[PDB]
Design a protein around this nucleic acid. Structure first.
Ligand SMILES: [Zn+2]
Ligand SMILES: [Zn+2]
Lengths: 471, 222
DNA sequence: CGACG
DNA sequence: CGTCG
């Protein structure tokens, strides 16, 4: 762990360890009523050389300068440890070690901060792709960055992030259930404790606004996915490239640029993109035929199904590692909703614009990844508005949200007996609908069979594009 | 809750932020609540009642802008109200209710003075215990609540959190914990209460109260 | 939050 | 503890 710099000893000393336990604690205390949003930091420092020991306290209000600190030199290590444990028990009401911690009123709560040959023979496009999805520099940057607006008190262990996730799901259950205002206040206090927020010196607000709650749930789910990817990176004589390829449990091939299926893919991408809600254009780079291990088997129950279609899906590149490792997955029942309008399931789009907007690519990383899946839709339950459903109606296999714009159905194409909606964007005759582009949804992981995967540059319409386009 | 505060000095130890001299104990003092730079909490900046108006604080209405006004002695309330400046049935009943308020105030204060005269702090703690009342921190609050109970009755526990209620300037606020994370916020001007019961030990001193229980009911600000 | 009677 | 900052 890190030595708090307000002590001026990060180089002269180091935080102390013993019995497989570290002596740095970061406690939060919140009351939305009175508005209190306080932090308490406690450390026991040991000089890198001699038997010199310190106790460092700091306290104040999160994301502000209100507060103070104190550094004491202790005559010994044992006196330091006694001082540390007694201060901890004073400020939290619990002991230093305990399987079952119990919150006590007016007492702080502890926060779980997370600290810390060459003989490959694969084709170069695939090697670049692997370098892309298993990138460690970007992963470590995003994992252990320093954003004092989102994480005013440091990185949070995945445990606490999922705890707050469940608290938000409970908040939504409550708001649904004609809840007590106090039932909401308890969860609001607990959440803002588990996840420190920089509110300057304003009273933290209640979690009544369900929309901002969906937003915070999206944030927490993003952090969870990043934690999972990092844990997957930390999986010799084989080359590291092949080593990380074997983690995927998928067979990858590169379609020939001048191929025919490749040209059909390219026509799909070109037709179904729209510069109307996307300030960029798409450029294909490499096509990839993928075959996941076992997924080819679990999809057989549906291969004789009707209305199998080849559709888009798009996520951030970090997850793609996992996505090839364990196919596409549905959310759990205890997780909250993050914005999707049709419950928890596998989502697809028929227009690359929509699914690509979910790559969240940046002008600094114009590259993104995007999957093509043969999804067995069967019978479409067609809806125009949001609806958090649970049971499909008797006779339906999938759901479809109808937008105001759709590929030209007359241009459909059959690849291996699979409809492909590569037509151009035209108007659908659907009146009184909220979606702009169609959405397809299934609720059984086995109804999807990943077939292809694309690398794409997002050519943004900035000064460079403006010069190349005006000359 | 408010910005300004007024009370009798609980200790002769606070230095005035103007004249930087010890404010004596039990003396009228006025604070301005200011945020602290040392920790995440407001702190009172105390002034002698005199020094407080020389700092140019333009208090329009003390009864509302100053926390703890409704709990001072009557003549001191009048002093704070004056210094803050430098239709028949309606007005008639207005005057009569004002006199009733003065009555109740001077009454509670005579009770507290008799108590402090005859009883000890532990005697008052025992009086509170016997009546199923929580013992607060601070001699002042102890005898304040003893008087509350003796006038209106042993407060009955909260309906939800089961914690004791306490009279604030405007209502009986609950002081209990609905959970280790958040505190309770019930308020009401009509709290349930059973009759106050002085233990028989203090009967010799309860005749030193001459009974005079009365059937009074807490008069709240408009 | 620490400091102090 | 119960004040005070
Ligand atoms: Zn003064
Ligand atoms: Zn209560």
């Amino acid at each position: 762990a890190a030595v708090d710099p307000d002590s001026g000893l990060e180089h002269s000393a180091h935080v102390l360890e013993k019995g497989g336990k570290v002596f740095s604690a970061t406690l939060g205390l919140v009351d939305i009523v009175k508005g209190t949003n306080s932090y308490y930091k406690l450390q026991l420092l040991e000089d890198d050389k001699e038997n010199r020991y310190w106790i460092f306290r700091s306290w104040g209000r999160v994301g502000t300068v209100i507060g103070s600190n104190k550094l004491e030199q202790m005559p010994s290590k044992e006196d330091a440890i006694e001082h540390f444990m007694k201060l901890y028990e004073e400020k939290t009401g619990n002991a230093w070690h305990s399987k079952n911690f119990t919150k006590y009123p007016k007492k702080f709560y502890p926060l779980e901060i997370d600290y810390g040959g060459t003989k490959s023979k694969l084709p170069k496009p695939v090697q670049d792709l692997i370098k892309m999805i298993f990138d460690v520099e970007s992963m470590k940057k995003a994992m252990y960055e320093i954003d004092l607006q989102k994480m005013p008190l440091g990185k949070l262990s995945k445990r606490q992030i999922q705890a707050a996730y469940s608290i938000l799901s409970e908040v939504q259950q409550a708001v649904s259930q004609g809840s007590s205002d106090s039932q909401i206040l308890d969860l609001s206090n607990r959440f803002y404790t588990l996840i420190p927020h920089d509110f300057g010196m304003k009273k933290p607000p209640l979690l009544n606004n369900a929309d901002s709650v969906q937003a915070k749930a999206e944030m927490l789910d993003n952090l969870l996915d990043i934690e999972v990817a990092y844990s997957l990176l930390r999986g010799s004589s084989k080359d590291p490239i092949d080593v990380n390829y074997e983690k995927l449990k998928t067979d990858i091939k590169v379609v020939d640029r001048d191929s025919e299926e490749a040209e059909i893919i390219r026509k799909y991408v070109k037709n179904t993109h729209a510069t109307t809600h996307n300030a960029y254009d798409l450029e294909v780079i490499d096509i990839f035929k993928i075959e996941r291990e076992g997924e080819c088997q679990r999809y057989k129950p549906f291969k004789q199904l009707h209305n199998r279609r080849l559709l888009w899906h798009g996520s951030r590149t970090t997850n793609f590692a996992g996505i090839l490792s364990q196919g596409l997955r549905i959310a759990p029942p205890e997780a909250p909703v993050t914005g999707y309008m049709f419950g928890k399931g596998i989502y697809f789009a028929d227009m690359v614009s929509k699914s690509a907007n979910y790559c969240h690519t940046s002008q600094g990383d114009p590259i993104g990844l995007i999957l093509l899946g043969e999804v067995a839709l069967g019978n479409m339950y067609e809806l125009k508005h949001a609806s958090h459903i649970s049971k499909l109606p008797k006779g339906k296999h999938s759901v479809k949200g109808l937008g105001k714009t759709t590929p030209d159905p007359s241009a459909n194409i059959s690849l291996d007996g699979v409809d492909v909606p590569l037509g151009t964007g035209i108007s659908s005759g659907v009146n009184d609908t909220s979606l702009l582009y169609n959405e397809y949804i299934v609720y059984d992981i086995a109804q999807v069979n990943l077939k292809y995967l694309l690398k794409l540059k997002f050519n943004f319409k900035t000064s460079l594009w403006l010069e190349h386009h005006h000359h | 809750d408010k910005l300004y505060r007024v009370e009798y000095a609980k200790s002769g130890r606070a230095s005035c932020k103007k004249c930087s001299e010890s404010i004596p104990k039990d003396s009228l003092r006025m604070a301005i609540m200011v945020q602290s730079p040392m920790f995440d909490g407001k702190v009172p900046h105390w002034y002698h009642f005199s020094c407080f108006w020389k700092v140019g604080h333009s208090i329009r209405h003390p009864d509302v802008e100053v926390d703890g006004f409704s709990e001072l002695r009557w003549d001191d309330q009048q002093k704070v109200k004056k210094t803050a400046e430098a239709s028949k049935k309606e007005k008639d009943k207005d005057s009569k209710l004002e006199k009733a308020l003065k009555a109740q105030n001077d009454l509670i204060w005579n009770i507290k003075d008799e108590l402090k005269k005859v009883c000890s702090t532990n005697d008052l703690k025992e009086l509170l215990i016997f009546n199923k009342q929580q013992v607060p921190s601070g001699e002042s609050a102890i005898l304040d609540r003893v008087a509350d109970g003796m006038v209106f009755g042993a407060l009955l526990p909260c309906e939800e959190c089961s914690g004791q209620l306490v009279f604030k300037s405007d209502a009986y606020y609950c002081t209990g914990d609905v959970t280790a994370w958040t505190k309770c916020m019930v308020k009401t001007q009509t709290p349930n209460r059973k009759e106050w019961v002085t233990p028989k030990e203090f009967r010799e001193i309860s005749y030193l109260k001459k009974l005079k229980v009365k059937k009074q009911d807490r008069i709240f600000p408009p």
